[PDB]
C-alpha cells in the first residue's frame, strides 16, 4: 500500500502498545504483529497489524535487526512519528 506517516501520543508510564516481529537477520521487515487494546498505538488510530515500520522519528528501521529496533522504538517519548506501510 502507500507509505503513511502516523502520529502517536504516548505518556511516560506506558509502552507503545504493539508487538513487533521480524528484523534484518530474518530477511523480513519490522512488522506490527499485535495492536494491544487501549494502549497508545490503538488509541492513535493509524497503526495496524501487518504494517511494516519503515522509520520512527526519522530513524530508518528497514535494515535494523530485531533487538536494534526494540531499543530504538522503546527510546521514543511523547509525540512520536511513524512511517509505515501495509503490504
Amino acid at each position: 500500500g502507500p507509505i503513511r506517516k502516523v502520529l502517536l501520543l504516548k505518556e511516560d508510564h506506558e509502552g507503545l502498545g504493539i508487538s513487533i516481529t521480524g528484523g534484518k537477520e530474518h530477511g523480513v521487515p519490522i512488522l506490527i504483529s499485535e495492536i494491544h487494546p487501549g494502549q497508545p498505538a490503538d488509541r492513535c488510530g493509524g497503526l495496524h497489524v501487518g504494517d511494516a515500520i519503515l522509520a520512527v522519528n526519522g530513524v530508518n528501521l528497514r535494515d535494523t535487526k530485531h533487538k536494534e529496533a526494540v531499543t530504538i522504538l522503546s527510546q521514543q517519548r511523547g509525540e512520536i512519528e511513524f512511517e509505515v506501510v501495509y503490504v
Partner: peptide, 7 residues
Amino acid sequence: RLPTSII
C-alpha cells in the same frame, strides 16, 4: 523461527 517483542 521469528522473534516477537512486546513494546
